[PDB]
Design a protein around this motif. Structure first.
Motif, short mmCIF file in Angstrom:
data_model
loop_
_atom_site.label_atom_id
_atom_site.label_comp_id
_atom_site.label_asym_id
_atom_site.label_seq_id
_atom_site.Cartn_x
_atom_site.Cartn_y
_atom_site.Cartn_z
N UNK A 268 -12.53 0.58 3.48
CA UNK A 268 -12.27 0.15 1.85
C UNK A 268 -13.11 -0.52 1.75
N UNK A 269 -13.03 -1.01 0.70
CA UNK A 269 -13.12 -2.18 -0.20
C UNK A 269 -12.38 -2.95 -0.19
N UNK A 270 -13.17 -4.14 0.00
CA UNK A 270 -12.36 -5.02 0.80
C UNK A 270 -12.46 -6.08 -1.00
N UNK A 271 -13.46 -6.16 -1.93
CA UNK A 271 -13.20 -6.50 -2.81
C UNK A 271 -12.65 -6.20 -4.20
N UNK A 272 -11.89 -4.70 -4.18
CA UNK A 272 -11.28 -4.38 -5.14
C UNK A 272 -9.84 -5.38 -5.54
N UNK A 273 -9.62 -5.60 -6.45
CA UNK A 273 -8.09 -6.65 -6.72
C UNK A 273 -7.80 -5.58 -8.44
N UNK A 274 -6.34 -6.14 -8.47
CA UNK A 274 -5.80 -5.91 -9.08
C UNK A 274 -5.52 -7.26 -9.99
N UNK A 275 -4.77 -6.30 -11.68
CA UNK A 275 -4.50 -7.51 -12.66
C UNK A 275 -3.59 -8.47 -12.51
N UNK A 276 -2.53 -7.57 -11.60
CA UNK A 276 -0.55 -7.86 -11.27
C UNK A 276 -0.86 -9.21 -9.94
N UNK A 277 -2.13 -9.12 -9.27
CA UNK A 277 -1.85 -10.08 -8.15
C UNK A 277 -2.78 -11.30 -8.48
N UNK A 278 -4.42 -11.21 -9.07
CA UNK A 278 -4.82 -12.06 -8.87
C UNK A 278 -5.55 -12.29 -10.82
N UNK A 279 -6.19 -13.83 -11.23
CA UNK A 279 -6.64 -14.67 -11.56
C UNK A 279 -7.96 -14.26 -11.78
N UNK A 280 -8.47 -13.67 -12.98
CA UNK A 280 -10.43 -13.66 -12.44
C UNK A 280 -10.82 -15.83 -13.17
N UNK A 281 -10.25 -16.21 -13.71
CA UNK A 281 -10.67 -17.85 -13.98
C UNK A 281 -11.39 -17.55 -15.81
N UNK A 282 -11.56 -16.78 -16.19
CA UNK A 282 -12.19 -16.01 -17.51
C UNK A 282 -12.32 -17.44 -18.54
N UNK A 283 -10.81 -17.30 -18.75
CA UNK A 283 -9.59 -18.19 -19.26
C UNK A 283 -9.76 -18.30 -20.50
#
Ligand SMILES: [Zn+2]
Lengths: 89, 131, 135, 154, 51
Positions: E36-51
Motif C-alpha cells: 500500500x502507498x504509505x503517502x496517502x492522506x485524509x483531510x480528517x486526519x492530517x493538516x497540509x500547512x498551506x495556511x
RNA sequence: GUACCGAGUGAUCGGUGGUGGAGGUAGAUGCAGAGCAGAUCUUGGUGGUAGUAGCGAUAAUUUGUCUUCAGCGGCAAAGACU
RNA sequence: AAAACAGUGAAAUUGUGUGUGGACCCGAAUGGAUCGGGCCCGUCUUGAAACACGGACCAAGGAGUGCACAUACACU
RNA sequence: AUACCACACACAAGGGAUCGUUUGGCUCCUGGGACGAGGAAGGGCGCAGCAGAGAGCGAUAUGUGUGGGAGCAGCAGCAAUG
C-alpha cells in the motif's frame, strides 16, 4: 479559562512559506525567516551538528558538481566541433 | 594463490558483484559448453545461448532430453527448453527454467549477427596466440 | 534389553534398590513459573531454608555422595564410553570387562551397520543396539 | 484443509467449520455447551423456542451477575439468558448439515451431535475517548467454530 | 475560503494529484514488492500547512 | 523444539520415539560485550476483574408501503418542535 | 519511529477430551477415610509473617570494564 | 461439585522466543581532497501507452558521435533500417 475554551480563539497564522528554503517559517510581521534568516545574505547559524548535517551538500541532487567531476576525469575535452579553438588556447 | 591486491576475495563483495551485474557482464552469465565436434567446427570453447539453438540437458529432472531454446530470462537467470514442463491441477502446462551451466550445445542458431560474433572471438585469440 | 555384567550378577539388584531418588528442587520453583527447577543456593537474610528450620526442604552437600566403587555404574553393571567411528571400538579391547559403548546420536544408519558388525567380532556390548535401525 | 480437533470416520459422519465469524465468543460457547450430545432434530426444535422467548439458554461458566428465570429449572439451575444473535447463526449451521446428510445418503434421523467446539479468533481494535483527555480501548472479540454429527448405532 | 493567493493554490493542486493508491496493474509485475502507498492522506486526519 | 527413560551431592550431561529440513561436535590451549526473580528496570505480547461498569442533558413520536436483504433507508398520511 | 526469509514455531494465555484433587511444599503410606512438620519472598535493620517498602503474568535485553603511573606476590 | 476453581497429558487456537541464513553496519589501512555571476549549494514545479511514492531527466524532459551487440520483467505494441 486558560485551557480548552482559549483554544477556540486561535484562528490567525503568523508564518508562511519561505521562498528561499520551503520551510513554512517566514514570519510576516517581523519580515524574517526563522529557518534560514531570509532576507539576510548569509544563511542562519544552525543550532547543532545533528541539525545542520540534514541540509548539507549531498543531501540533494548536486547536479552541477557531479558533471564537473566527470569532465575533469575526461581532461575537459569540450564540444568536438570547436577543437581548433581549444588547441590554439 | 592470488598475489594481486586490487582484486577482492570477500564473500560479501563477490556476491554483490554477481547479482547486480548489467550489460556485457550479464551476458557472460549465460555461457554454456560446446560439444566435442563443434569445438573442431569452430575455434570457440563456449558461447552465450540464444533462441533457436539446440541443447542437451546434462543435470536435473530433465536429464538426457534434447530440444530447442524458446526463451532467455536475464533477470532470473534461466533458459526455457522446448518440451521441459510441468502440469498443474488444471491440466495446464508451464515451462520450467534451467540454469545455463546445466546445458550443452549440439547445434548453433546462425541467424543474425552470430557469424560475426564468432569471427570476432577467434581473431582475438590468434592475435595473442601467434605472438 | 536384560543383560548384566557377569562380575556383579549376584549383587546388581542390591545395588539398584539402594540408589536414592531424592530431588533437590530450587526453593519456590513451585510458586512462580519464571523460576526453573535447577538448584541455586539461597542467600537471603531472612530465608527459612538457608537457616535450616524444621519443615523446610534439605540442601545438597558432600554427605550424599555415593561410595567410590558404585559411582557412575549403569543399571546393567557397566560404565559407558561414547563412540562415533570404527576406530573408536579399538580402544575398548582391553577394558571390555567393565566398560560398554554408546554410539553418538548423530551417527547415521549406513555407518551404524558398520559399527555393529565390528562390535560383534570384537565382543563389545553396545547399549543403543536397536537405535534408529529397527525398521 | 483443516485438522478437526478429534478423530471420527468420514463414512457415517457429516462436518462443517468456519473462521473469524463476528459472533461474540463468550456467548457462543454457552450455546454450544447445552446442545452437545443432543439429537439434531431436537436441537433445531429447541433453538426455535429460544428465538421466541419460550425457552432459554442456561449459563454456567460465563455467568456472573446474570438474571434468574423460571425457564432455567429445566436444567436444574436458576440462571438463564436469550442470546438471539448467536442462536440465529448456530441454527443456520445445523440446518445445512441436514442437507448434507440427506444428499450423502444417511437418514435425516438418528443423527447425534457428537463433537462441537468454539475457539477465540484475533481481536479487532477500536477506541473510545474518556475524560481528562484520555483514550481507552473498545475492541471486538470474534470466534471460530467446528461441528461433527454421527449416526447412532442403536 | 474563496479568496486565495497564487502560491496557496499551486500547493493545493499538487497536494491533490499526489493523493492516489498504487495502480492495479503494477501489482502483477515480477519485481514489485509494495503493498500500500504509505503517502496517502485524509483531510480528517492530517493538516497540509498551506495556511 | 517436545514427550519419556538413565548418569552426577550439584552446577549440568547422555540416549529413545514423533516434528524439522541443513549443518554440527569431542580433547588441549587463546581472546572476552561470558550465566538473572527482583532495580515504581527497558521493549514487545497476554490475563483476572467481566459479558460486568457503562453506552439515554436537548423537540417526540406512530401507522402503512416499497426496497434493503433486512438500514425508525426512501415515499405517503398524521402528531410535535426551533 | 516500526517493519528480514510467503523456513523453524518456545512460554504466558484459551477451547475440547481423558484423568487426579479443593492454595501449595517436604517426610511416610492405603482398596479406602489421611497422619506428622511447615506463616511470603527480596531488602535496610538490635529486631520482619508483619498494620515497613518493591513485586499481576511470560519471553528477550540488563550492572567491577579499558588505559597510564608506582606496588606486593606467583611464574620465565 | 453433574456443570465452578486448580493441576497433568493429547489435539486445536494465540503469540513470535530459539536454531539455521544475510547485496547492511562498524573499525583499521591506503588513495583522493575535484563548487559559484559561463548563475553554485539548497528549495519548488513539470516529463511515461496504461504511472501514486521513489529513481532518472528538463518543453530537445531516452537527441548526436564512438566502442560493442539481443532483447524490452506485467498487458498491449516495438526491435540487425539496432
Ligand atoms: Zn527560509
Amino acid at each position: 479559562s486558560k485551557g480548552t475554551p482559549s483554544n477556540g480563539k486561535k484562528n490567525k497564522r503568523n508564518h508562511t512559506t519561505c521562498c528561499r528554503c520551503g520551510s513554512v517559517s517566514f514570519h510576516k510581521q517581523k519580515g524574517k525567516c526563522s529557518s534560514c534568516a531570509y532576507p539576510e545574505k548569509k544563511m542562519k547559524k544552525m543550532q547543532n551538528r545533528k541539525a545542520m548535517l540534514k541540509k548539507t551538500t549531498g543531501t540533494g541532487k548536486m547536479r552541477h558538481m557531479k558533471k564537473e567531476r566527470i569532465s575533469r576525469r575526461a581532461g575537459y575535452p569540450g564540444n568536438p566541433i570547436l577543437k581548433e579553438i581549444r588547441n590554439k588556447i | 594463490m592470488k598475489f594481486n591486491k586490487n582484486v577482492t576475495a570477500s564473500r560479501r563483495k563477490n556476491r554483490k558483484a554477481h547479482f547486480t551485474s548489467i550489460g556485457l557482464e550479464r551476458t557472460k552469465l549465460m555461457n554454456a559448453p560446446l560439444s566435442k565436434d563443434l569445438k573442431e567446427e569452430y575455434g570457440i570453447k563456449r558461447i552465450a545461448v540464444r533462441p533457436g539453438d539446440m541443447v542437451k540437458v546434462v543435470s536435473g529432472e530433465f536429464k538426457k532430453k534434447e530440444g530447442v531454446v524458446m526463451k532467455v530470462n536475464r533477470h532470473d537467470i534461466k533458459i526455457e527448453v522446448e518440451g521441459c514442463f510441468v502440469q498443474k491441477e488444471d491440466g495446464k502446462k508451464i515451462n520450467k527454467g534451467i540454469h545455463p551451466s546445466n546445458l550443452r550445445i549440439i547445434k548453433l542458431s546462425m541467424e543474425k549477427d552470430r557469424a560475426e560474433i564468432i569471427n570476432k572471438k577467434v581473431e582475438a585469440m590468434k592475435s595473442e596466440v601467434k605472438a | 534389553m536384560d543383560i548384566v555384567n557377569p562380575s556383579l550378577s549376584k549383587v546388581i539388584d542390591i545395588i539398584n534398590k539402594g540408589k536414592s531418588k531424592k530431588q533437590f528442587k530450587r526453593f519456590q520453583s513451585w510458586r512462580v513459573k519464571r523460576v526453573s527447577e535447577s538448584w541455586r543456593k539461597p542467600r537471603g537474610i531472612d530465608n527459612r531454608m538457608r537457616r535450616k528450620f524444621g519443615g523446610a526442604p534439605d540442601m545438597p552437600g558432600i554427605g550424599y555422595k555415593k561410595p567410590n566403587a558404585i559411582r557412575f555404574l549403569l543399571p546393567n553393571g557397566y560404565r559407558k564410553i561414547m563412540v562415533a567411528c570404527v576406530k573408536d571400538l579399538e580402544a575398548l579391547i582391553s577394558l571390555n570387562s567393565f566398560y560398554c559403548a554408546e554410539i553418538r546420536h548423530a551417527v547415521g544408519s549406513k555407518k551404524r551397520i558398520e559399527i555393529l558388525e565390528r562390535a560383534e567380532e570384537l565382543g563389545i556390548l553396545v547399549i543403543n543396539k536397536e537405535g534408529k535401525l529397527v525398521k | 484443509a483443516h485438522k478437526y480437533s478429534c478423530d471420527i470416520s468420514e463414512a457415517t459422519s457429516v462436518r462443517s467449520q468456519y473462521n473469524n465469524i463476528k459472533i461474540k465468543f463468550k456467548n457462543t460457547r454457552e450455546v454450544c455447551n447445552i446442545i452437545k450430545t443432543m439429537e439434531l432434530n431436537k436441537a433445531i426444535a429447541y433453538l426455535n423456542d429460544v428465538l421466541r422467548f419460550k425457552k432459554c439458554i442456561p449459563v454456567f461458566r460465563f455467568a456472573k451477575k446474570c438474571g434468574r428465570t423460571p425457564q432455567a429449572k429445566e436444567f436444574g439451575t436458576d440462571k438463564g439468558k436469550w442470546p438471539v444473535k448467536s442462536v440465529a447463526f448456530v441454527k443456520k449451521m445445523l440446518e445445512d448439515l441436514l442437507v448434507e446428510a440427506e444428499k450423502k445418503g444417511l437418514g435425516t434421523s438418528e443423527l447425534v451431535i457428537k463433537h462441537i467446539q468454539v475457539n477465540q479468533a484475533p481481536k479487532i481494535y477500536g477506541r473510545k475517548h474518556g475524560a481528562f483527555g484520555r483514550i481507552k480501548p473498545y475492541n471486538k472479540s470474534p470466534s471460530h467454530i467446528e461441528v461433527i454429527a454421527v449416526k447412532r448405532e442403536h | 475560503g474563496s479568496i486565495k493567493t497564487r502560491r496557496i493554490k499551486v500547493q493545493l493542486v499538487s497536494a491533490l494529484k499526489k493523493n492516489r493508491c498504487i495502480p492495479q496493474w503494477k501489482r502483477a509485475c515480477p519485481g514489485f514488492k509494495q503493498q500500500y502507498n504509505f503517502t496517502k492522506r485524509s483531510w480528517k486526519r492530517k493538516t497540509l500547512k498551506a495556511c
